[PDB]
Amino acid sequence: GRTNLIVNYLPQNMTQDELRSLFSSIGEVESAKLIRDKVAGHSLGYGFVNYVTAKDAERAINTLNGLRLQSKTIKVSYA
């Protein structure tokens, strides 16, 4: 049933389109949002990805959790 993911510990320089792309490699992404701070607009290094199907969301966690991007290991879990 769950399709909404939170993705933590993204590199500071990863763009919202790159976040979208990484997750679209697994299946159809309904939406992808990179959270930025409202004062200076810098990435806060986390985002939300919502899949069209629950099966794809589960596949995303299984595939992408723990992926090392630049200096850090990302976490992918249910929102």
From Swiss-Prot:
Molecular function per GO: double-stranded RNA binding; lncRNA binding; miRNA binding; mRNA 3'-UTR AU-rich region binding; mRNA 3'-UTR binding; mRNA binding; protein homodimerization activity; protein kinase binding
Residue span(s) of domain RRM: 3-79
GO CC annotations, alphabetized: cytoplasm; cytoplasmic stress granule; cytoplasmic vesicle; cytosol; endoplasmic reticulum; glutamatergic synapse; membrane; nucleoplasm
Free-text note on domains in this protein's UniProt record: The first RRM (RNA recognition motif) domain is essential for binding to AU-rich elements.
GO biological process: 3'-UTR-mediated mRNA stabilization; cell population proliferation; lncRNA-mediated post-transcriptional gene silencing; mRNA destabilization; mRNA stabilization; negative regulation of miRNA-mediated gene silencing; positive regulation of autophagosome size; positive regulation of autophagy
Shown residues in whole-protein numbering: 18 to 96 of 326
Post-translational modification: Phosphorylated by MAPKAPK2. Phosphorylated by PRKCD.
Domain of life: Eukaryota
Family recorded in the similarity comment: Belongs to the RRM elav family.
Protein name (record): ELAV-like protein 1
Localization, UniProt: Cytoplasm; Nucleus; Cytoplasm, Stress granule; Cytoplasm, P-body
Tissue: Ubiquitous. Detected in brain, liver, thymus and muscle.
Gene for this chain: ELAVL1
Its biological purpose: RNA-binding protein that binds to the 3'-UTR region of mRNAs and increases their stability. Involved in embryonic stem cell (ESC) differentiation: preferentially binds mRNAs that are not methylated by N6-methyladenosine (m6A), stabilizing them, promoting ESC differentiation. Has also been shown to be capable of binding to m6A-containing mRNAs and contributes to MYC stability by binding to m6A-containing MYC mRNAs. Binds to poly-U elements and AU-rich elements (AREs) in the 3'-UTR of target mRNAs. Binds avidly to the AU-rich element in FOS and IL3/interleukin-3 mRNAs.
Keywords recorded for this protein, A-Z: Acetylation, Cytoplasm, Isopeptide bond, Methylation, Nucleus, Phosphoprotein, Repeat, RNA-binding, Ubl conjugation
Assembly and oligomerization: Monomer and homodimer (in vitro). Interacts with ANP32A. Interacts with ZNF385A; the interaction is indirect and mRNA-dependent and may regulate p53/TP53 expression. Identified in a mRNP complex, at least composed of DHX9, DDX3X, ELAVL1, HNRNPU, IGF2BP1, ILF3, PABPC1, PCBP2, PTBP2, STAU1, STAU2, SYNCRIP and YBX1. Interacts with AGO1 and AGO2. Interacts with IGF2BP1; the interaction is enhanced by SEPIN14P20 peptide RBPR. Interacts with IGF2BP2 and IGF2BP3. Interacts with HNRNPL. Interacts with DHX36; this interaction occurs in a RNA-dependent manner.
